[PDB]
Amino acid sequence: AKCVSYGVSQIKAPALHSQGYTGSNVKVAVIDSGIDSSHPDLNVAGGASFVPSETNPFQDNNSHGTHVAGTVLAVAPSASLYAVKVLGADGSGQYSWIINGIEWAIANNMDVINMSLGGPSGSAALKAAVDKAVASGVVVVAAAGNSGTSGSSSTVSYPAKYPSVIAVGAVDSSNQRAPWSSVGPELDVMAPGVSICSTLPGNKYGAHSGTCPASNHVAGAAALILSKHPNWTNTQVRSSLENTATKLGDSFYYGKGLINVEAAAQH
């Protein structure tokens, strides 16, 4: 009935909020199912739809992208979020649609791309677009995936699996890896992703679990770091997050560990 996720204080975002840094001026493309801009606790700054049968990026039929927007804004309240819709009612999107989203983010000078989406395969064209975004200076963050462990295999999804992307896995309030959080050498950092409370369509709130909400926290944290260091490059934003993370378990399962946006914004 109007929650804030425990994850905001777990990544130490409050420490930036009290310095007066809240993501002001940072363009964040939420590449997802869209965002219910009808929600009174959300500011959407604009958007576009690359789903051919669904022209409206501000209608969230699946309720995923609205949750994403909320979690990004809980970390970075004055961030400018753009609803970039590449996922249909079925919850999946063609590579051509997702690539259209990424090309859009580059053309409209997004500072941060959040991709709370995955699949088990890549494409040369997908990797090309993600790399091109990071070359042009965009911080690209993506959910590591919800495939759990599978012996010695990487279970990290594309595009999080690409080295040009910040792959984000999910811990709970105890910094324990969620059993469904994907794993592998491509896993970069962890953030809260268990029962994360946020905005849902129709002026509602509720908890989602997944690496999607984990990655939402990191995209938020990037917007908080660029609030404070507006002249930092994506390389510097990414190093700050990785080099100041709180170490947890092995890097196969946890990567660098829990992000600490407080320590990151001092680096």
Residue numbers in the entry: 1 to 75, 85 to 276
What does the paper say about this structure?
Omniligase-1 is a broadly applicable enzyme for peptide bond formation between an activated acyl donor peptide and a non-protected acyl acceptor peptide. The enzyme is derived from an earlier subtilisin variant called peptiligase by several rounds of protein engineering aimed at increasing synthetic yields and substrate range. Mutation A225N in the S1′ pocket and F189W of the S2′ pocket increased the synthesis to hydrolysis (S/H) ratio and overall coupling efficiency, whereas the I107V mutation was added to S4 pocket to increase the reaction rate.
Thus, Oml-1 and other omniligase variants containing mutation F189W, which is crucial for the broad substrate scope, cannot be crystallized in crystal form A or B. Crystals of variants containing a Trp at position 189 were only found after a long incubation time for Pre-4 (Ptl-M222P/L217H/A225N/F189W) and Pre-5 (Ptl-M222P/L217H/A225N/F189W/N218D). The structures of Pre-4 and Pre-5 each contain three protein molecules in the asymmetric unit (molecules A-C). In both of these variants Trp189 is involved in intermolecular contacts which are different from those in Pre-1-Pre-3. In addition to the role of Phe189 in crystal formation, we observed that for both Pre-4 and Pre-5, crystallization resulted in at least one substrate binding site occupied by a peptide sequence. Variants Pre-4 and Pre-5 crystallized in crystal form C containing three protein molecules (A, B and C) in the asymmetric unit. In crystal form C the structure of molecule C is more different with RMSDs of 0.6 – 0.7 Å to molecules A and B. It has an oxidized cysteine and a bound eglin fragment (41′-46′ (SPVTLAG P5 -P1′)) that was used as a crystallization aid. In this crystal form C, we also observed a crystallization artifact; part of the loop from Ile205 to His217 of molecule C is forcibly drawn into the active site of molecule B, mimicking a peptide substrate. Hence, the conformation of the five N-terminal residues of chain C (AKCVG) also changed. This is an example of a crystallization artifact, and shows that ligases have a strong preference for binding a peptide in the active site even if it is their sibling. The second effect is due to F189W in the S2′ pocket, which serves as a strong binding force to drive the binding of substrates with hydrophobic residues at P2′.
